[PDB]
Amino acid sequence: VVDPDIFNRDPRDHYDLLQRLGGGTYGEVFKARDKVSGDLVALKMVKMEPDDDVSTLQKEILILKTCRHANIVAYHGSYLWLQKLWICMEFCGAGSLQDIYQVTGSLSELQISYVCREVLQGLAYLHSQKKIHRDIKGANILINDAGEVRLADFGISAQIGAELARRLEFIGTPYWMAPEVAAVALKGGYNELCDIWSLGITAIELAELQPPLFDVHPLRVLFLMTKSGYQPPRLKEKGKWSAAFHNFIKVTLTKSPKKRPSATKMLSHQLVSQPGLNRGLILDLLDKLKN
Amino acid sequence: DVVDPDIFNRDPRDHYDLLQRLGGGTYGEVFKARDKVSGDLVALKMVKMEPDDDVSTLQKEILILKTCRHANIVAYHGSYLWLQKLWICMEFCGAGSLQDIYQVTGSLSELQISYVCREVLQGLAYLHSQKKIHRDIKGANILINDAGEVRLADFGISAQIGAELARRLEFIGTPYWMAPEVAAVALKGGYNELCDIWSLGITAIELAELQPPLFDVHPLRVLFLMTKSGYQPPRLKEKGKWSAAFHNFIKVTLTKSPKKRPSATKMLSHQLVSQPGLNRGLILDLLDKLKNP
Numbered sequence: 001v002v003d004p005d006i007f008n009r010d011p012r013d014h015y016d017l018l019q020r021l022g023g024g025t026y027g028e029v030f031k032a033r034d035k036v037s038g039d040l041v042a043l044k045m046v047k048m049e050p051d052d053d054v055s056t057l058q059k060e061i062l063i064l065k066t067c068r069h070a071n072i073v074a075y076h077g078s079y080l081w082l083q084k085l086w087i088c089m090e091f092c093g094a095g096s097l098q099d100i101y102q103v104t105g106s107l108s109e110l111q112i113s114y115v116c117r118e119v120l121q122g123l124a125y126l127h128s129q130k131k132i133h134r135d136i137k138g139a140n141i142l143i144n145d146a147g148e149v150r151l152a153d154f155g156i157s158a159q160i161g162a163e164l165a166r167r168l169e170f171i172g173t174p175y176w177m178a179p180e181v182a183a184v185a186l187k188g189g190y191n192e193l194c195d196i197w198s199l200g201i202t203a204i205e206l207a208e209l210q211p212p213l214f215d216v217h218p219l220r221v222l223f224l225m226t227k228s229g230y231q232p233p234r235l236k237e238k239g240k241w242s243a244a245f246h247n248f249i250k251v252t253l254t255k256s257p258k259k260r261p262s263a264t265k266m267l268s269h270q271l272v273s274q275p276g277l278n279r280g281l282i283l284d285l286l287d288k289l290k291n
Numbered sequence: 292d293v294v295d296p297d298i299f300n301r302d303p304r305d306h307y308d309l310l311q312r313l314g315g316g317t318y319g320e321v322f323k324a325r326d327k328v329s330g331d332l333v334a335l336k337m338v339k340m341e342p343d344d345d346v347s348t349l350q351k352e353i354l355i356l357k358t359c360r361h362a363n364i365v366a367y368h369g370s371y372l373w374l375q376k377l378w379i380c381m382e383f384c385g386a387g388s389l390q391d392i393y394q395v396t397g398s399l400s401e402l403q404i405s406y407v408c409r410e411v412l413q414g415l416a417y418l419h420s421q422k423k424i425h426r427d428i429k430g431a432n433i434l435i436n437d438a439g440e441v442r443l444a445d446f447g448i449s450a451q452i453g454a455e456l457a458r459r460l461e462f463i464g465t466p467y468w469m470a471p472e473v474a475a476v477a478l479k480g481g482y483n484e485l486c487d488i489w490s491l492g493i494t495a496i497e498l499a500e501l502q503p504p505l506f507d508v509h510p511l512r513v514l515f516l517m518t519k520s521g522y523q524p525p526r527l528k529e530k531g532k533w534s535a536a537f538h539n540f541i542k543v544t545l546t547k548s549p550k551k552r553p554s555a556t557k558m559l560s561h562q563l564v565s566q567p568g569l570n571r572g573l574i575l576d577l578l579d580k581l582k583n584p
């Protein structure tokens with residue numbers, strides 16, 4: 001049972017499917033139009049084979065449904081019909097920042113500052129609800145035709161939450177277990193501040209078109225991050241970026257999560273609290289797509 | 292998809308006489324069996340293996356058993372696939388687990404426990420040198436043969452964890468945006484091999500008292516207590532029954548902080564387990580007690 005409010009009907013009763021936009025972590029997303037209002041929506045479709053654990057999709061719907069914040073893609077309901085789950089969400093007409101920068105080239109510092117502010121607002125909200133995105137990157141930060149910014153793809157978040165509940169269910173007998181083994185079963189071994197690091201990396205991505213170590217094998221990156229006194233990455237070109245931008249990167253990429261600032265503390269940072277950050281900056285970026 | 296590159300595609304009943312069901316560990320079931328040619332006794336672990344089953348846990352268990360060559364880990368003789376059943380052929384340990392034994396004999400002597408702890412530490416030192424973690428050290432998983440020798444068994448939890456890690460690593464996407472603490476948990480799971488040292492400490496109390504500490508407390512409540520700050524590590528109940536060296540062995544093995552808990556190698560230097568009078572003779576005496584109590 002995927003959701004108590006699920007619509008047991010064909011979403012094509014309400015929506016005209018327009019085109020496949022591609023896929024996130026899992027499933028496939030369609031652009032669609034409400035047949036009554038004419039409003040555009042995104043419809044994420046996920047197959048449901050007979051012997052499938054529903055807990056991941058359960059958790060994703062639950063996350064989306066209980067968010068009401070402008071910087072998180074709005075949720076409109078879900079459908080189950082002919083073994084396909086459809087999650088109905090806000091549509092963002094310009095796609096991801098990755099889709100955009102792959103045409104336009106690197107974002108300006110002000111554009112990056114605006115994006116980071118809007119993401120931080122989204123993250124502050126999520127973290128206030130004890131939710132963790134866990135997949136903050138350019139591909140999951142969507143832009144609408146108004147230049148507004150939305151966090152999308154809670155697939156990783158949902159998988160993690162499903163795994164945690166499964167680990168708790170099947171923890172087994174604890175009497176011989178070391179406390180650190182018990183602790184990670186119960187708590188998962190990291191917290192929401194992982195999203196702040198990911199935003200710092202995203203800020204570099206938007207500036208340079210790639211995250212740090214993009215050319216290094218992903219398993220090898222995991223080894224290097226855990227090895228030694230691992231040094232947090234930095235922006236490549238010192239002279240291109242302000243002291244405030246360099247500082248934003250330093251502070252977001254604090255190695256120790258005990259010392260890494262919260263989303264709320266980061267919203268007070270000079271880079272993101274400055275005047276003149278608004279959707280107009282992204283409207284200028286979207287103009288580059290035509291000109 | 293391949294279960295084992297060295298798998299025997301034949302009926303193990305062509306080679307072995309099944310003698311009696313010994314019970315089951317984490318998964319599967321185990322039989323005492325006798326080699327029809329040599330006469331040697333073995334353990335045959337049977338696990339159902341249908342054509343469209345995930346093989347990865349059994350793959351990993353075989354791999355663990357096959358690549359250990361150390362006296363304190365149950366020996367491996369090969370595996371059979373026949374009529375949708377995987378049979379894992381191992382060393383047979385004729386006195387069963389220490390749990391099986393103490394439920395008849397009552398509590399082990401301090402010297403008996405000291406010898407067991409030494410032999411388990413040797414097993415652990417070896418496993419940890421190979422980047423393997425047992426993760427399920429307890430009386431039920433420490434086997435005794437008819438020679439009074441001590442063998443680590445049932446790597447089922449170890450195999451499951453290793454299969455999970457492999458799957459997590461296979462489907463790790465593009466982790467460039469991952470925070471170091473998340474990357475740490477992806478690779479290591481947020482603990483290390485020193486978890487086995489804690490488990491041995493608890494086992495030493497189990498052998499001494501016939502139960503691990505807090506066995507009468509609900510297991511969810513125990514988990515609640517452990518994860519609290521100011522959790523006190525457990526202790527032996529009767530102070531006067533046990534030596535200062537045994538008390539100290541418990542103190543150091545049950546070090547709350549894993550950054551400060553001693554390694555298997557460091558623990559082998561401990562007074563309790565470096566005693567000159569530790570040998571299988573102590574366990575031969577325990578097996579004699581088991582025969583006519």
Ligand SMILES: COc1cc2c(cc1Nc1ncc(C(N)=O)c(Nc3c(F)cccc3C(F)(F)F)n1)CN(C)CC2
Nearest residue numbers: 021022023024029042073089090091092093095152153
């Ligand atoms: C014109 O609009 C778009 C063009 C393109 C894309 C995305 C959109 N818009 C768009 N709006 C809303 C959502 C939503 N509520 O989830 C979304 N999800 C989505 C997806 F539809 C495909 C893939 C991934 C994801 C993600 F969930 F990860 F965001 N997408 C994705 N690009 C890779 C190619 C071009």
Ligand SMILES: COc1cc2c(cc1Nc1ncc(C(N)=O)c(Nc3c(F)cccc3C(F)(F)F)n1)CN(C)CC2
Nearest residue numbers: 313314315316321334365381382383384385387444445
């Ligand atoms: C007379 O011998 C025995 C009597 C009894 C037992 C075990 C043995 N011997 C025995 N020898 C070798 C193995 C092996 N190579 O793995 C083994 N495994 C095993 C098992 F056979 C059943 C259950 C669990 C496990 C374990 F893998 F955890 F060790 N067992 C188990 N007792 C619960 C009841 C009585």
